[PDB]
């Protein structure tokens, strides 16, 4: 169960740090369209994570970054936590604006399957992704750092539109 | 074996990326004392990782940062990889200059032991650290990205001087 340790590292190293500061960082960008106050984490179950999000879906477009976050982590002075704001389109229209990013450890799982001494078979990527998502979902439930600031988007492709999948979660929070 | 997955994530997510660019980034700082061309990663086996390195040892002092590194990681535009340069002192003298940082996943292991649903007992921190160091050492041996650009410093405290432990590795590379 590699995913278990990566899920915790994902919370302890990243979400536990950025989420409490997240809501303050978003409304700082607005004052300086409208951006949603939740962090949207894409969780593809096939464990493939493009680097450029715009090449995952043409309807997902990059707009601008957030004001960064600084902190001293394990001796590194002012380690930089940055996030990107993406606009999702429908039929050439702007259907919403939010901070959107993949879950990096999914990409790392994909990499581990290729390396020989990782001892991780490529057939287990799908099951480890399911464990990663389920484990993380258990974290954010009891996570004091996370209260209505985060939504995990998990999907398994069978042609697929990722923009519509995100917009679905987006329009449900509008209710 | 949580450490196994974290060791691979440490290589795939961080060292595999920064090491090939590392030697070029150091000699760029010099042209712009002298800094060593190796990245020094502290690996305390008790899994305790201070955030401010200067409070680990008074003889370890912060000097300046390196020119940063940019890349698009899992949808985040220009994710920032930064590093800090530290000066190590002996009897009020500057005994060397190099980039020095703890291994972050050691800090995460320490955190996981505290959380209830992590299923990770605090008695296993020492054994998981040993696994993390040994696993990582196996990675960097066959790692094409790492050739004489990195040295792992592992130590187990019994009063302890961390500066002397680092300087030992530093003076051996001078040979
Ligand atoms: N700024 C950021 N932006 C976006 N996501 C982020 C994020 N910081 C964390 N996360 C997420 C949490 C997870 C574990 O974070 P953690 O700090 S406990 O363990 C890291 C660390 F030891 C080392 N490392 C990597 N980059 C860096 C770096 N710039 N400076 C220092 N050390 C680094 O490599 C390990 C694995 O990295 P990953 O990216 S594969 O997984 C990360 C990623 F999914």
Q: What is the 3-state secondary structure (H, E, C) of chain A?
A: CHHHHHHHHHHHHHHHHHHHHHHHHHHHHHHCCCCCCCEEEEEECCCCCCCCHHHCCCCEEEEEECCCEEEEECCEEEEEECCEEEEEEECCEEEEEEEEEECHHHHHHHHHHHCCCCCCCHHHHHHHHHHHHHHHHHHHHHCCCCCCCEEEEEECCCCCCHHHHHHHHHHHHCC
Give the residues across from B42 on adjacent strands: B102, B153
Pull the structure tokens for residue B161: 């001087």
Could you give the C-alpha distances from A75 to A3, A18, A138, in angstroms and in order? 27, 18, 30
b/e per residue A33-68 (b: at least 16 CB within 10 A): eebbebbbbbbbbebebbeebeebbebbbbeeebee
Q: Give the separation between CA A1 and CA B15, rounded to whole angstroms.
A: 23
Residue A117 CB partners (closer than 8 Å, separation 6+): B138, B139, B142
Tokens 């505290």: give the residue: B114
Pull the structure tokens for residue B10: 């440490």
Pull the structure tokens for residue A31: 């004052």
Chain A contact probe: residue of B10, B76, B120 with most A CBs at under 10 A: B76
Q: Give the separation between CA A62 and CA B26, rounded to whole angstroms.
A: 32
Q: Give the separation between CA A86 and CA A60, rounded to whole angstroms.
A: 6
Q: Give the separation between CA B168 and CA B154, rounded to whole angstroms.
A: 12
Q: Cα-Cα-Cα-Cα dihedral of A71, A73, A79, A82, to 10°? A: -80
Contact A75 B2 (CB under 8 A): no
b/e per residue B78-113 (b: at least 16 CB within 10 A): ebbbbbbbbbbbeeeeebbbbbbbbbbbbbbbbbbe
Q: Cα-Cα-Cα-Cα dihedral of A30, A35, A37, A43, to 10°? A: -140
Tokens 């691979």: give the residue: B8
* CA dihedral sign, ordered A108, B136, B4, B52: negative
Alpha carbon B71 to its chain centroid, in Å, reads 20
Nearest CA to ligand 1 atom 26: B14
Alpha carbon B30 to its chain centroid, in Å, reads 21
Method: X-ray
Sequence positions preceding breaks in chain B, C–N over 2.5 Å: 32, 158
CA B108 to ligand 1: nearest atom: 18
A58/chain B closest Cα distance in angstroms: 13
- The phi-psi region of residue A129 (left if phi > 0; otherwise alpha if psi is between -120 and 50; otherwise beta) is alpha
Pull the structure tokens for residue B45: 């086996």
Strand pairing report for A150-155 and A39-44: parallel
Q: Domains of chain B by range and CATH?
A: 1-35 (no CATH), 36-173 (3.40.50.12100)
Could you give the C-alpha distances from B10 to A81, A129, B3, B162, in angstroms and in order? 17, 19, 10, 23
Contact A152, A135 (CB under 8 A): no
Contact A4, A107 (CB under 8 A): no
For a mutational test of ligand 1's pocket, the pick from B2, B8, B9, B65, i.e. the residue with the most ligand atoms closer than 8 A to its C-beta, is B9
Contact A5 B8 (CB under 8 A): no
Q: Give the separation between CA A159 and CA A56, rounded to whole angstroms.
A: 12
Q: Give the separation between CA A137 and CA A131, rounded to whole angstroms.
A: 10
Q: What is the 3-state secondary structure (H, E, C) of chain B?
A: CHHHHHHHHHHHHHHHHHHHHHHHHHHHHHHCCCCCCCEEEEEECCCCCCCCHHHCCCCEEEEEECCCEEEEECCEEEEEECCEEEEEEECCEEEEEEEEEECHHHHHHHHHHHCCCCCCCHHHHHHHHHHHHHHHHHHHHHCCCCCCCEEEEEECCCCCCHHHHHHHHHHHHCC
Contact A169, A41 (CB under 8 A): no
* CA dihedral sign, ordered B108, B110, B116, B122: positive
Residue of A nearest to B84 (CA): A76
For this entry, resolution in Å reads 3.0
Give the residues across from B149 on adjacent strands: none
> CA-based diameter of chain A, in Å?
50
Q: How long a stretch of residues is chain A? A: 175
| Rg of the Cα atoms in chain B | 17
Tokens 């790692």: give the residue: B143
């Amino acid at each position: 169960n590699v995913a278990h340790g990566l899920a915790w590292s994902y919370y302890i190293g990243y979400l536990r740090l950025i989420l409490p500061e997240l809501q303050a960082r978003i409304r700082t960008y607005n004052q300086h369209g409208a951006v949603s106050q939740r962090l949207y984490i894409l969780l593809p179950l096939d464990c493939g994570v493009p680097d450029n999000l715009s090449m995952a879906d043409p309807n997902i477009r990059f707009l601008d970054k957030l004001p960064q976050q600084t902190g001293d982590r394990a001796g590194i002075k002012d380690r930089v936590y940055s996030n990107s704001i993406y606009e999702l389109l429908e039929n050439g229209q702007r259907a919403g604006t939010c901070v959107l990013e993949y879950a990096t450890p999914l990409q790392t799982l994909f990499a581990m399957s290729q390396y020989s001494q990782a001892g991780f078979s490529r057939e287990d990527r799908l099951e480890q992704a399911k464990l990663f998502c389920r484990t993380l979902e258990d974290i954010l439930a009891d996570a004091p750092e996370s209260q209505n600031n985060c939504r995990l988007i998990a999907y398994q492709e069978p042609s697929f539109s990722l923009s519509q999948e995100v917009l679905r979660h987006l329009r449900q929070e509008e209710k």
